[PDB]
Structure formats: C-alpha cells, structure tokens
Amino acid sequence: PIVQNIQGQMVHQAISPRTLNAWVKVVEEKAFSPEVIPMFSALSEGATPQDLNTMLNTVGGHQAAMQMLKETINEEAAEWDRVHPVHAGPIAPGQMREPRGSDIAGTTSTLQEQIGWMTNNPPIPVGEIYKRWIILGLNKIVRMYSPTSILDIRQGPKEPFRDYVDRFYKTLRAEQASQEVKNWMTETLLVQNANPDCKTILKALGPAATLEEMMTACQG
Amino acid sequence: PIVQNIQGQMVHQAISPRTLNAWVKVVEEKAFSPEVIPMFSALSEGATPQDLNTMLNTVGGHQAAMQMLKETINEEAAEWDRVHPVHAGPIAPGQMREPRGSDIAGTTSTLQEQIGWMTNNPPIPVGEIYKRWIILGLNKIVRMYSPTSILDIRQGPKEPFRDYVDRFYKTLRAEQASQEVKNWMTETLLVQNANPDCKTILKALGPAATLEEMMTACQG
Amino acid sequence: PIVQNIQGQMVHQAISPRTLNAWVKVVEEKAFSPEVIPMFSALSEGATPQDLNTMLNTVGGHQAAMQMLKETINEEAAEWDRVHPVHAGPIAPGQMREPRGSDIAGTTSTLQEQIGWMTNNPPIPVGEIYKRWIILGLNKIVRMYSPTSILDIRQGPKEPFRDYVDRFYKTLRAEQASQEVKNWMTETLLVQNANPDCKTILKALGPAATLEEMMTACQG
Amino acid sequence: PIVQNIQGQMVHQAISPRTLNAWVKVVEEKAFSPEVIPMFSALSEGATPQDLNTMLNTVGGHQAAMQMLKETINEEAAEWDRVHPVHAGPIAPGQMREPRGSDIAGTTSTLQEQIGWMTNNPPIPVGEIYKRWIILGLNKIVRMYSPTSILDIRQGPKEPFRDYVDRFYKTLRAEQASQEVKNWMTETLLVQNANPDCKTILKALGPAATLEEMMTACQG
Amino acid sequence: PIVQNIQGQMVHQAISPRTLNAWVKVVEEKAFSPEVIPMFSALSEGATPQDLNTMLNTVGGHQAAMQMLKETINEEAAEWDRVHPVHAGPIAPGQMREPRGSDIAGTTSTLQEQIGWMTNNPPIPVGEIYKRWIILGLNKIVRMYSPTSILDIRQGPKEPFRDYVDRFYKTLRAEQASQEVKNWMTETLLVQNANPDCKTILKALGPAATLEEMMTACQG
Amino acid sequence: PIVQNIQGQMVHQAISPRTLNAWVKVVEEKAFSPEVIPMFSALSEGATPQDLNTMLNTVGGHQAAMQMLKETINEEAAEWDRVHPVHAGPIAPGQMREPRGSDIAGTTSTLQEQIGWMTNNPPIPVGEIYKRWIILGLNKIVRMYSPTSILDIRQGPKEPFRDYVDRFYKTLRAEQASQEVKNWMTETLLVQNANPDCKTILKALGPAATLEEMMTACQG
C-alpha cells in the first residue's frame, strides 16, 4: 500500500505480514458475519489491486464465497468496460493509457503500472474502485450466509427479550434489503412477535415507545 | 484520527489495524464492563467521527446494545439541532459552515468536512461532542447490563467481607446515581447488609468510619 | 528484499525476521494448502534469489517436497541454459555478463551479482524468474498433496450443496488442468455430480447457471 | 504522557494503547505485589493527571482497593487544600491560577489546565504529586493485601534458609514501618527466627552478619 | 549490527531485543536441526562480532555444542593466523591495522575497532569471516546431533513411502558429505531400502527415475 | 534510555513496556542462569540509573538475590565514594557537580540530573558504571545459584557422556572462579571422571585429544 513521506509524496510499500495475518485470522475466527466489511475496509486502505488480490486469494476455505466474490467482480468489470470503452492508437506522452475492467481488477497488469495510475496527475483511484467492488461482493456474501429470513422470527415462551432482539437485529443487519424498509420492519415486526405478557406490556406504551423503554418494560 | 505532525501541522492519519484489533478483543474478552468506557475513551483520542463509526461497527454481537447506542446518538443529535439551529445560505470562502447533528454523527459528513471542522481555527469540537454522545450511550448500556440491583446486594453467612465489599462496590459503580446519593448509600446500605458477625464489628467501630478501618477490622 | 527509498536510490535490505517467522509459521501450521503459494508470493516481493533460497531453506520437514522443488528448479535452469546461449571472454566494464541458469538459481552467484543484475539498464528480472520457478515447484507440490481427484467428487445424501461446492472448488483450485479445460469442468461436473434433488432443481434452472442462483435455488 | 520533541517543544501525546494493555495485564495477572508499584511508576512517566485517572479507571475488579485509593487521594487533597490557601479574583494573563487540591487531583479540571501547569515558568508539577498520592494509596493497598505479618515468620524444620529469607524479605518489602525500624528488624529477627542449627551457625558467625556470608554459612 | 543510514553513512545500531528473543525461541523449540544455520544467517545479517558473541552467549543449555563451536572458532583463528601473518609496528593514521586471528572473534577487539574495520574503504570482511566460522561450527554440531546414520534408514513393512522418504531425506540433509557423493548415495539407497512391493514398483519405473515419478508410483 | 536523532544529538526517552515485559519474563521463566547477564546487558543499553532501578525493583520473587545485588551495589558505591571524594563549595557555571557514590545508583537524584550527566561535555557514563556494578552483582547471584561444586562431578555408569559434559560445562560456566584455572580444569577434571570403558577410550588418544574426537570416541 502507498504511504506518504515527510515531504508529502507517496511511493509503493510492501504489504505488511501483520495485515495479512490479522485478515486471515479474522476471516477464520469470525467467519462471514456483518463485521468483516468494516475491518476489510480498514485493513487495506490505499492497497493496490495486487494487494487486494492477495488478501482474497489468501483466504483458505469458504471457496464458494470466494467464487461468488470473483463472479461479482467479473460482472462489475464487464459493466465498467461496457460503460467506459478504451481508446486505441498512440497514447500521449504525459498521460498513461486508461485501464480496462480486467486491468482495473488488477489481473493482467504489473504493480508498477498500478503505482503509476495511483500516483498520476491527476491520480486515478483504481484501488478505491476495486475496493468498492470487493465490498459489494462481501455484502452479497454476508447476504448469502444469512441463516434465517426476517419474517420467520418468533420469540419462544422462555427465550428472553434480549436474546430475541439480538437475533432480530443480527439477521436484520445481515438482510440489508434497504434502509426505509428496515425502519418499517423495526417498527412493525419487532413488536408484532413478542411473548403475550411482555407483548401487552409493550402495547401498553403504544407505537410511540422507543427501544429503551421497550426493553426496560420486559426487564425485571 | 488526526495527530500533531512535525512540524505543527495536523494531517489525517487513518486508524491503525492494531487499535481496531485491541478494541475488538476488549469487547470480546470484557463484554460490557464499567471500565470499557475509559478504555474506549483512551483508544480513540482525537478520533474523527468516521473512526468512531468504524470502532462501533467492528463490534461483534451485542446488537441490541449497539441499537440503543445508535438511538441515543440520534436523540442527542436531535437535541443539538433543537438547541443549535443551522442557518441556510452560501458559505464563506475561508470559514466552514456550522455542522448539524447528522454532520456530527458522521452520517452525511464526508471525511474532508470533518478534517476541516477539526483543523480550522477556531476548531469545531465535533470529535469531543460525538465522544460525549457515545459515552452517554455506553453508560446507558453498562447500567442496563447490571445483573442485579444495588439494593439486593447482601452478604452470605460465611461469605468473607472481602468479596462482599468487592461485589457491592462493583454493582454500585455499574449503578447510576448522583454522587451525593452514592455518599448516602455507602453509609446507609453497606454496613446494614453485612454479615451479623462482622456487622457487630463494623458497628463497634462507628458510623462515620472509613472503608480501610472496617476492612482491617473484619480482616480474617 | 529491495525496498525503494523515497525519491531516492533503491536500497538493499535483509529479509525481516518477522517475514521469515511468518513464513515458517504458515508452512508449519497449514502444511501445503493451495493458499500457501499466494501467501508466499505476497511475503516474498522484490526479493533476491538469496532471499528466496533462505526462505526455502528455513522450511523444516517435508523434505520430499523440498527435494521435488529443487529438482523442478534444476529442470527449469537446465531448460533455460539449453535455450539461452552463454557468452564468455572479456566483458566491457559497466555491463554485467550473461546470467547463467545456475546463477539465476542463486547456487553459483553472490548477492553482489544478483543486485547488479537487478539494477542493470534494462533490468533483468532474475528474482521474478526464480520466483516463477519456485511457484511452478510449489504448484507441483500442492498437486501432489491433493487427497482426492476432481473427477471422483460425489455429494453425500445429507451433505449440503454448500459443503459440496466448497469441496469441489477446493479440489478445482488444487487441480492441474489448463484454464480452458478448467472452465468446462466447473460448468458441467458441478451440476452433473450433485444429489438428485438439487440436480433436477438446477436442470429446471437450465442454462446460464451461475453459482449465486444455483445456491439460492438449492436452499432448504 | 508528555514526550519532549528532539530540539523542540514538549508536545503532548495521548497514552498509547500498549501502556494501558500492559497495565491491565499486570494488574490482572499479578494481583497487587510490592513490585507492581515500581512497574506502575515506570509505565506512567511524565503523565498528566488525566492519564493517571485513565490508568486507574481501567482497572477491573478489586473495587475495595480502588475505593481505598480514592479515599486516600481525597484525604491528600483535603490536606493540601488545608495547608495551602487558594487565591481568587481577577488573575493576570499569562499566569495560571492557584491549583486546588480537588484540581490537583484532576477531578475538577480539563487537560488544558494540567498542560499549562506542567509548562509554566517555573514549572509546577501536578503529575509528580498526583503520582505520589497514588503511590501512597497503592502502598496502603499492598500493606493491606499482605497475608502474614513480619513478626510472625518462622522457618520450617525442613524448609531451607533460602526460602525462609525469600519469604522474610518479601514480607519486609510489604512492611509499613519506617526505614530505621526496617533496618533493625532485618538485622535482628532474621537470625533471631531461623532454624536452631543454622541459628547457632549464624551466632558463631557473630556480628557484622552480611546476607551472602549467612547464605554461604547455612549451605548444606 | 551496522546498517545503511540515510544518507549513505553506516552507523552502529545495537542489536534489537526482539531479534535476541527470536533467536532464543528458535534455539528453544527448533533446538539443533538443519534449518537453524539458515535462520541464524538471516537473523544476524551484517552483524559485528560482538553481536554474534551476544547471540551465542544467550543460548541456554547445550553447553557441549557451544564448547565445540568455541573450539572450532579457535581452530579457525589459529589457521587464519598461520595463513595471514600480521606484521607488528606503528599503524598508519589513515588506514587501520590488519586484524589478527583473535580480532575476528571479538575477544580482544573493541567495538570501535570492528566498526572501523567494517566501514573503512576498503572494508575488512570480519563479520562474514566470523559468520563462516560459526557456520562451520554449526554444521559440525548439526552433523553430530544426527540420531542415526544414513545407512541405517530403512522403511517399515506398512510405513508409507511418504514418511520413509521424508525421514531419509531429512537424515541425508543432516548428514555431512559432498553433493557428488550424495548423487550416488540417493540412487543406491532410496530404492533399495523401500518396502518389497514398493521396491518392485519403483524398479518398474527405471533406475534413473525422478523423485516425483517414484512418488506418484506408490501414491496411496 | 537515550536515543540518537537525525541531527545526531540524544535526549531522554520513556522506557518501552516491551523491554520491561521481556526482562520480567526472562527473569521468571529462566530464573537465574549464566545466560541472564548477556540478556540484561542487551536489554538496557544506554539506560539511565532510574531505568536500571526500575528493571531491578520490577523483579518479583527471588528477593534474596535482589538483596544480594543491592548489598553489592552498596559496597561498590561506598568504594567509589572512598576513591573519589566530591568537592565542596560553589560549582562552575559551565560544569555540573560530579555525582557521589550513592547518586551513581540514582537513589537520591532526579532523572533530569542523570540526563545532564550522560549528555554533558564531556559525557559522564553513570549508566555504564551502574550497569557494571549490576553485572557484577548478577555474577555473584549466578555464583550462589550454582547447584553443585566443580569437584563433585562424577559420571554415572549409564549417564551418557553428552549429559556428563553438558552438566560439567554448565556448572563450570556457573563457577567463574577464573579463566586459566578453567583451562586447567577442562584438561584434568574432564578426563579424570569418565566411565571406565569410555575412560580408557579417551586415554587411547592421549592428552593431545580435542573435545570433538573426545566425544566421537565414546559416540556410537
């Protein structure tokens, strides 16, 4: 990943083994849960497409998820090539040729060319584009790992309200259908599926009730 | 988070992966203890709102508590907007606009806008305000996670005074109240709920005795 | 490796103890899984043949695999020396001589000659060729460690489609066939070797079958 | 802490997470040994009272010891405020006001006042006083934590002299008496409490008994 | 060890504690094996003789091996003295004296003299010579630590070919002999000591069969 | 410990928690062995007397050895004060007062005075003097922790020669009576205490025999 110097300029730097070790360990230990996308975006800030291909190929196991991510990256690269055709002929001396989708992916280009793209004037953010594509692929992967659907949630007679709302919001963050649909769901489905006693305790507070009073009602 | 860089010019330095790993580990190992608040306040010194959002997203589990935290952040932003209205219009070329609640919460504010609001003279304390909000939310969470009420703390027949006062002060620190209420409670509740064998000893010392005198009295 | 100094001449640097410890640890911990080749290509970047020989010699155990890798390096060096004539006699100053196969292997050269061949104009990628040879050898090794063949994978009656495709893609990554033949295999045998229920499901799905829709169809 | 820049101003720097991690690790693993006080004084060097409050609040468990430490800090602050009058009214610019005991404790101030008091000319060190108070409190704690007294140490018939002198000097390090009383006891009760055989050996050694001579005499 | 410091002026940098801890760990777990010589050469790149003495003193246990190493260093020093005589007399102000046989081992040579001998132009390769001596000693020690001879390696009746060839090549690498002798040793011993069925299987392939074909013959 | 900067000057630096942790771990895990003195000398290069008092007070357990070290430091300081009396009266403006015997230890002087003493013109090496004293104390400690004497060594009928020579050289390095006496002992006591069969095998080679042939004789 590129790093700025004392005078402000930046140059390529070898990827730290600690970053790769932490990424592989968090992938192994935390599997594919909603909290891998923020850590992935934090680990590889400013990473070249070669570094992202490294961080993806290094993930042993869960090869189906990695194949899904590869297919998503392939579709995004095809759409990028369709929306931005590259020109042919001689290239200007002060400009380097613009990358194609397969080259934005970093599959058929050298590291020096990535560094030249990233440190050009004006700079070309190939790393950020490929990171956005990988984040979309990881969103689709965490959607696939979702164990249950949002509608099938029903609290057991003994399962505490805390565990119920924990499971609910876990699969809700794993759903990621939309934002306003999520807002409507947390109003309706959250109170629609409570245990009868605590259910009517929550209905006593009306729809204006917030989550804090919703929990301290059934609390104790 | 931004940091003083040689010489005297603050530049943006992205959050280090080791800090995120330390935060994930402390939330995994210590769950939601009263001490986490200081560990969180010390791990994120001078952090941009984006860094605090990253540190709150990287949490694994406890989704209910994170939801209460987000809702209290929204409530604090609404109160800030009700107290600090924002006037619309074109901005000054050299001075930045006054941020709204959504600009403080890092939801709709780009990283450059936050860097501006922080490094500008005079500085806008967006980081400290968002930290105060998150600290209020964490106080709510740790006061909710209390297993038993402070009024129910009672010593066993052979439970030593050591573990009794340890558990009592732990629950009292987790409990929420003004300092004078705690000053009254440590004088009215501590000696009364003790074991009678050592309760007589504490009564023999006196009502206004300090903690160390009673502790060395029932020592052994 | 050879770290490129900021706005200055590229300076040689000894391999980091951290890098070597991470390498020996991943070897010992994961044996020879298909990701050890990407992780090796990641750890060893811009490294001299001396660095690569050190990284290979620090490996303890699997001496059969090490001897096979050395035999592959010897075969590659023999082919290089056969298809590339070696010049001799007096050599003009400021121009290094013709690198032999035994020298590009690093068994008959020195760090000075390696750095000279990597700093010449135009540069000669001695490191990038020796790394290519090591990757060919590691590919042979990981093919030898393949427990089962690819044509002999059959889904269990209870073993789910996710686990089946995970094993299938792991064996495909281990497979030695060319990429053009590799595609037809994942297009045909994936749906031709599954259990009858989801087999008929994917048959009703028909052509243009992609992994995402396949896994969404075989749900439940 | 307050790191002194090389040829520059003493720039303030937030406590690194490593310091707090080591502090919580030692206070968790080693409980309250006599040496923890030296390690605490080592980790926190030139630290603001905010840093010391953060280091104390991060301690998890042993809440009775923390309450005793806070009571000791309160007593020291009361004494400081009693024996030092506090000025008020308009204060000349460029000169900070009189530091109060509750203010020298850092409970009624921000980081700016502490940094100003630790940068004034002449300097008024708040850190070296608040650390002194914390060390007095930790000394009271480690004295309270000692399981056995110094006057009640007796060597076992089979237990050798080395283990006996180890326990004796550990309890002496935990002792609360003045240094002259400490010298008196380490001069007399050491030989006055040993096993009769080596007791007579050390009596034959006579006056000017020195520890290495004692341990060389009691050999075998 | 000395290191190239910005810009172009080598200055002395003391050995880092982490390197010493890595060395102690590798001489605690790996103990003495063929892989230790390569690890040692990588941990001590460009080390002054004082650093190598420090790294050889920190080894706990195995005092016989360290004594062998010291005696072989003395023997190499005597041979260097017998081959490179040192003339006595006053030294020139510009250039340094020729190091004696014991000035290499860092016994009577101060650190400043070694730094001079290394940074002078032309440099005196004291570090590489002492490293060659230590490497000869380590080769002696690892050839001594061999449990059995290479002639005694024989495969069990049901012991798979994998473990047999692994153990055989490990003992052959630990053994000390010229590579030319090993070329006959392998073709004479590998096939003969195998299991009778696998013996005939390998003999069916041919005498000059490579290792990979011989392996894939009895694979499984 | 002081550290050099880019301009070449040195200034105080806070002691790293990693150094303290490594020292405490090596002191406890390895207890007292001849290889604790090189580790101590390597860990605290350039450390101020305050840092050495930290590294000594931080050693929990083995308080008798620490008291021996304190007594040795006290005797060395008394001898230093006797051999170098300090002058009275006003001190010159360009010179700082020379440290007394007790102030070399850093017991009654602040850190700033140590830094001024170490970076004066000309510099005064108080740190090196106190390190020499501590190394002498540690030598006496490892002398006391020697389990057996050098003369009592007699190899058992079954104890292998390797274990015998290991124990011999261990307690010989732990003896440190002298260096030429060590050279006489390794000639006489090593050959005088062998098992009769291997004893006469060693006598077959005469006194001119070296250790390598000495061991390979009894080997196998």
Q: Which two tokens stand for residue F193?
A: 């205490």
- Token look-up 């002078």 returns E120
Residues 6+ apart with CB under 8 A from E77: E101, E102, E104, E105, E133
Q: Quick one: closest CA in A to C22, which residue?
A: A17
Contact B144 A30 (CB under 8 A): no
Contact between F9 and D7 using a beta-carbon 8 Å cutoff: yes
Structure tokens at D189: 């009760």
CB F42 within 8 A of CB F112: no
User: Which chain C residues are within 8 Å of E35, Cβ to Cβ?
Assistant: 24, 57-60
One-letter amino acid at A120 equals: N
Query: Which of E135, E211, E216 has the highest number of chain C CBs within 10 A, making it the mutation to test binding with C?
Result: E211
Give F203's Cβ-side CA count (13 Å radius).
Answer: 9
Q: What is the resolution of this structure in A?
A: 3.6
Cα–Cα distance for residue pair C88/C148, rounded to 1 Å: 50
Using an 8 Å Cβ cutoff, are C46 and C1 in contact?
yes
Contacts of D182 in chain F (CB under 8 A): none
Question: Whole-angstrom Cα distance, residue E176 to residue F110?
Answer: 59
D176 with D138: CB under 8 angstroms? no
Q: Record the tokens describing residue A74, joined without a space.
A: 């392939």
A39 touches chain B (CB under 8 A): yes
Q: Do C60 and E33 touch (CB under 8 A)?
A: yes
In F31-62, which residue ranges form alpha helices assigned H by DSSP? 37-43, 49-57
Candidates C92, C122, C116, C91; CA nearest to C104 is: C116
Q: Which chains touch D (3 or more CB pairs under 8 A)?
A: B, F
Q: Which residues of A touch C45 (CB under 8 A)?
A: 14-15
Q: Chain E within 8 Å of C94 (Cβ-Cβ)?
A: no
Q: What b/e string do you get for D143-170 counting C-beta neighbours within 10 Å, with b at 16 or more?
A: ebebeeebeebebeeeebbbebbbbbbb
Q: What ranges in C61-145 are assigned the alpha helix state H?
A: 63-83, 101-104, 111-119, 126-144
Tell me whether residues A5 and C6 touch, CB distance under 8 A.
Answer: yes
Q: CA geometry: angle at D151 spanning D146 and D157, to 5°?
A: 100
Shortest distance between the Cα of D216 and any Cα of chain B, in A, equals 38
Q: How far is CA F167 from the centre of its chain?
A: 20
User: Residues C69, C108, C144, CA angle at the centre, nearest 5°?
Assistant: 0
Cα Rg of chain F (Å, integer): 23
CA-CA distance, D214 to D165, in Å (whole number)? Answer: 10
Structural contact between residues E24 and E59, judged by C-beta atoms closer than 8 angstroms: yes
Nearest-CA neighbor of D137 among D81, D71, D82? D71
Nearest residue on chain B to D72, alpha-carbon basis = B212
Distance from C-alpha of B133 to C-alpha of E10, rounded to nearest angstrom: 52
The three-state secondary structure class of C4 is: strand
For residues D176 and B212, give the distance between their C-alpha atoms in angstroms, rounded to a whole number.
15
The answer to whether residue C16 neighbours chain E at the CB level (below 8 Å) is no
Neighbouring subunits of B (3+ Cβ pairs under 8 A): A, D
Helix-helix angle D161-173:D179-192, to 10 degrees:
160
Which of E118, E190, E101 shows the shortest CA–CA distance to E151?
Answer: E190
Q: Is the CB of residue A145 less than 8 Å from the CB of residue A31?
A: yes
Closest to E17 (Cβ–Cβ): which among F19, F166, F215? F19
Class of domain F3-145: mainly alpha
CA distance F195 to F160: 9
F188 contacts: CB under 8 Å, gap ≥ 6 = none
Alpha helix (H) ranges present in E106-210?
A: 111-119, 126-144, 161-174, 179-189, 196-205
Using alpha carbons only, what angle is made at residue F38 by residues F36 and F42, rounded to the nearest 5 degrees?
115
- Interface check D100 vs B, CB under 8 A: no
- Are the beta carbons of B173 and D71 separated by less than 8 Å? no
Question: Which tokens hold the place of B66?
Answer: 């994170």
Count other Cβ atoms within 10 Å, centred on residue A107.
14
Distance CA F195, CA C51 (A): 48
E147 touches chain F (CB under 8 A): no
E82-111 CB burial, b ≥16 within 10 A, e <16: eeeeeeeeeeeeeeebebbbbbbbbeebee
Q: How many other CB atoms are found less than 10 A from the CB of residue C216?
A: 11
Distances (CA, A) of E84 to D86, E78, E98: 80, 10, 9
Q: Is B9 on the interface with A (CB under 8 A)?
A: no
Chains E, C in contact, 3 or more Cβ pairs below 8 Å: yes
Residues of E in contact with F22 (CB under 8 A): 17, 21
Quick check: A36 and A138 in contact, CB under 8 A? yes
To the nearest 10°, the Cα dihedral for E136, E141, E146, E150?
A: 20
Question: Computed from CA positions of residues A174, A177, A180, A184, in that sequence, does the dihedral angle turn out positive or negative?
Answer: negative
CATH class of D19-145: mainly alpha
> Which chain B positions have a beta carbon within 8 Å of D59's beta carbon?
35
Residue B102: name the closest of B123, B81, B71 by CA.
B81
* Rounded alpha-carbon distances, angstroms, from residue F167 to C91, F146, F220: 59, 11, 20
CATH class label, E2-145: mainly alpha
Of D57, D61, D140, the CB nearest to B38: D57
From the candidates E16, E33, E39, E186, which should be mutated to test the interface with C, based on the most C CB atoms within 10 A?
A: E39
